[PDB]
């Protein structure tokens, strides 16, 4: 057995309407459950035989199809529903076992443009003792996504550059994003002018400080 | 009724290992059959295989190198072999309910209850503490009415670290960001709050039995 779910992510704004498909490799009848996972939980159950709604769940959520295809529809989106949503099918006998989860269909929630302010954080003192430093810089409660330039004097830099978001705000539909610089003592001794540059779109904002003040 | 996973923990390549799914408020009776499913970093949901409660049933990549077994009426295990960097993931253990065929079949109905994951990970390195480290803005510049402070948690294995901020009773304005893991193999993350007027950072590494208290304040 295979669940194929397609499209892998899709979005709409706060309110809209969104269907997430999945396909079975045969025929299942009516036995599909659908399930939403937020980052660091567990899945938890939204929808099973295809259309029977859990308890607690609200009407926003509902089931469709049989046999080789179902659907997932989301009336009335709110970010508090950005999220994973994987289908899922199970049989079991003593001679054949067909179980699957479906890839999943990530949400991006659409919500109010917001740009985003930036922080620069220097080295702590004790960090350039070690032989390795690590340069901070936050994007704060932002939408839609940014991108994160680093300049060392002038010069891009591609390598030691790790970046991590948080999910979607539960309420607001906004990010919160750290991109982290790594260098040797002796490179971040080497050079003076430290900057970080978040782009959304047209606007950028760009801190930096000096490594002597 | 609540499910609680134990056992995750830092193993070498080729190691096996046994994690256990304890009920609470309610026991393992002859309508469950528990499930174990896991999740690798980012990636998503796979199927292990499930044990009824009152004989089992596993997946075809997993069959023939774990199993799972019923120890009590509150526990089940899953004893895995052979491990390797592919293992490493989340291991969740859920509550099943199926309907019956009829002919000797059953359809799992849904999962209604999930404990909260023990992690799993596959690595020839060795468990190590993070390094805290204040994030302050720099000294030569002109402190604000308001200031974004933090703390930098670098270079640890296995996952997870926790972070409160003031001993728990600091949480609003604290984003704390999900772990990268770095090309050495090692995880790092970093946590801001912001403030207007100290302020403490505690960081907790379960694995290497470790707390760490970072005191940050702005540098002039």
């Known amino acids: 057995i295979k669940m194929t779910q397609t499209p892998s992510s899709v979005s709409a704004a706060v309110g809209g309407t969104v269907t997430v498909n999945c396909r079975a490799s045969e025929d299942i009848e009516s036995y599909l459950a659908w399930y939403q996972q937020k980052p660091g939980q567990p899945p938890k159950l939204l929808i099973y035989d295809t259309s029977k709604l859990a308890s607690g769940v609200p009407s926003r959520f509902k089931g469709s199809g049989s046999g080789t295809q179902f659907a997932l529809t989301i009336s009335g989106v709110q970010c508090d529903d950005a999220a994973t949503y994987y289908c899922l099918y199970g049989y079991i006998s003593s001679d054949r076992i067909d179980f699957g989860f479906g890839g999943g269909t990530e949400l991006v929630v659409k919500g109010d443009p917001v740009a985003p302010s930036v922080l620069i954080f220097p080295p702590a003192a004790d960090q350039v003792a070690t032989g390795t430093v690590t340069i901070v810089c936050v994007a704060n409660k932002y939408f839609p996504d940014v991108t994160v330039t680093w300049e060392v004097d002038g010069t891009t830099q591609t390598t030691g550059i790790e970046n991590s978001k948080t999910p979607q705000n539960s309420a607001d539909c906004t990010y919160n994003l750290s991109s982290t610089l790594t260098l040797t003592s002796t490179q971040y001794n080497s050079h003076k002018e430290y900057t970080c540059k978040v782009t959304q779109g047209t606007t950028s904002v760009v801190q930096s400080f000096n490594r002597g003040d | 009724q609540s499910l609680e996973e134990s056992g995750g923990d830092l193993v070498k390549p080729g190691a096996s290992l046994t994690l256990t799914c304890t009920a609470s408020g309610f026991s393992f009776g002859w309508n469950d059959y528990m499930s174990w499913v896991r999740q690798a970093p980012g990636k998503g949901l796979e199927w292990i295989g499930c044990?009824?409660?009152?004989?089992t049933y596993y997946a075809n990549w997993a069959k023939g190198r774990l199993t799972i077994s019923k120890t009590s009426s509150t526990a089940v295990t899953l004893q895995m072999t052979s491990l390797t960097a592919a293992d490493t993931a989340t291991y969740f253990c859920?509550?099943?309910?199926?309907?019956?065929?009829?002919?000797?079949?059953?359809?799992?109905?849904?999962?209604?209850?999930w404990g909260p994951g023990t992690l799993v990970t596959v690595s020839s390195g060795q468990p190590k503490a993070p390094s805290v480290f204040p994030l302050a803005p720099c000294c030569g510049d002109t402190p604000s009415s308001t200031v974004t402070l933090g703390c930098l948690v670098k270079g640890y294995l296995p996952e997870p670290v926790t972070v409160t901020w003031n001993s728990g009773t600091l949480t609003n304005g604290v984003r704390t960001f999900p772990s990268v893991r770095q090309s050495s193999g090692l995880y790092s993350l970093s946590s801001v709050v912001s403030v207007t007027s100290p302020v403490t950072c505690n960081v907790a590494h379960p694995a290497t039995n470790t707390k760490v208290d970072k005191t940050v304040a702005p540098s002039t």
């Open positions: 044990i009824y409660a009152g004989s």
């Open positions: 859920a509550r099943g309910a199926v309907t019956y065929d009829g002919l000797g079949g059953a359809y799992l109905k849904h999962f209604n209850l």
